[PDB]
């Protein structure tokens, strides 16, 4: 019902990687505009990494950190 939705993370990292520099993480709702849910993490160095929810290790990152 709104065009507020946007696919910020065009590409995601599928290769397993668990950085200890993650302090915060944001979750973006895909909705009708985006077929896949977008998960992004924020590193203490001001770095952003896009993760694919289809990957099991990605869930581990979210679950373990939160």
From Swiss-Prot:
Coiled coil: none annotated. Disulfide bonds join 7-34, 9-50. The record marks 1-2 as: Cleavage. This is IL-8(6-77). It comes from Homo sapiens (Human). The chain holds residues 28 to 93 of 99 of the full protein.
